[PDB]
User: Fold this.
Amino acid sequence: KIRLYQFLLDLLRSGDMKDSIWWVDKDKGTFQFSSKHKEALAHRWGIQKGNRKKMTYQKMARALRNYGKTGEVKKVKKKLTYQFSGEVLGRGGLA
DNA sequence: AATAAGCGGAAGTGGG
DNA sequence: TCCCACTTCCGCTTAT
Ligand code: NA
Assistant:
């Protein structure tokens, strides 16, 4: 099963949910979710995973928080805004 | 208050 | 056994 950070990077590449998530500074890997449309994106994550319950943005963000220590995704000091690591960005484009 | 978001411990579930 | 990679639940805090 795909990892959450990869699901998000792939969405940003495809633009399929551009009203729910977007790059802020793609060269730096900063991205942001829509206040009003993030739940639809969270629902898609849960369905992709086949989880028992309906996924919510809150649960998805709780998972994102666990990447802060290992570094794949860090929370930036703006609402609903995060930053991928250089490792995630480089390996992603190469893959 | 109403609404929204942030913080994050802890217990539960997957798939090795 | 026991970690992976989250998921789910819960109580608390901050927004300015
Ligand atoms: Na605010």
